[PDB]
RNA sequence: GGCAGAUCUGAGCCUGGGAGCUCUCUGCC
């Protein structure tokens, strides 16, 4: 999974 | 009862410069 946190890039596994 | 998503539109350390983690929540038979 790939998402963005507080504008930052956060990725979690798939 | 276990599973599956979500980041400010989920937060916490950023060790994040984001595959780093960490935790909570919802519906199913």
A14 within 8 A of A3, measured Cβ to Cβ = no
Range list of β-strands (E), A1-14: 2-5, 8-11
Residues with CB under 7 A from strand B: A 1-14
- A1 Cβ contact list (under 8 Å, min separation 6): A11, A12, A13, A14
The last residues before gaps in chain A (C-N over 2.5 Å) are: none
A10 within 8 A of A4, measured Cβ to Cβ = yes
Dist CA A14 CA A1 (whole Å): 4
Rounded CA–C1' distance between A1 and B18, in angstroms? 12
- A6 Cβ contact list (under 8 Å, min separation 6): none
How is residue A8 written in tokens? 């930052």
């Amino acid at each position: 999974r790939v998402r963005t946190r507080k504008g930052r890039r956060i990725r979690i596994x798939p």
